[PDB]
């Protein structure tokens, strides 16, 4: 689908310590959006169970870049019984200094998760040995929103 660039994060969940913990580290070829420049990408984090928000981080904004760097760690309290069923959606979004910032791309992995974005919530669930990163295409908000609905 539309070429909107990658997002690549680490995660890791531990039963007996009831934490799951999400590792923006860096996106790459984002699409540009402000005329005649770049974007300022910073990323958000929702954590959801049965369509609701339970949990929400933000990154810091890197200016002018299409290949953001973060390496930012969050951790959010799931018990063993709500991690099947919860999902993390990563937002990757444009700084705008006047106006509305500009979504880039969405994806989400988790419960009803598909391809390589349930292939990297079963490797998080078999393996709380380290965190596992993996990269994921952006696809276009209205898309993923409307499988998160
Ligand atoms: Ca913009
Ligand atoms: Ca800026
Ligand atoms: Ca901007
Ligand atoms: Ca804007």
């Not at 009831?18 to 420049?37: R, S």
């Not at 300022?40 to 369509?51: A, E, S």
């Not at 002018?64 to 018990?79: A, I, M």
Request: net charge positive; hydrophobic share 40%.
């Amino acid at each position: 689908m539309e070429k909107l660039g990658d997002i690549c994060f680490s995660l890791r969940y531990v039963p007996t310590a009831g934490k799951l913990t999400v590792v923006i580290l860096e996106a790459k070829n984002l699409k540009k959006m402000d005329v005649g420049g770049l974007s300022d990408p910073y990323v958000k984090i929702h954590l959801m169970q049965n369509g609701k928000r339970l949990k929400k981080k933000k990154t810091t904004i890197k200016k002018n870049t299409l290949n953001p760097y973060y390496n930012e760690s969050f951790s959010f309290e799931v018990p063993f019984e709500q991690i099947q069923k919860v999902q993390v959606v990563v937002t990757v979004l444009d700084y705008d200094k006047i106006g509305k910032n500009d979504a880039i791309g969405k994806v989400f992995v988790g419960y009803n998760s598909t391809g390589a974005e349930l292939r990297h919530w079963s490797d998080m669930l078999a393996n709380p040995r380290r965190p596992i990163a993996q990269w994921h295409t952006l696809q276009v908000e209205e898309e993923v929103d409307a499988m998160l609905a």
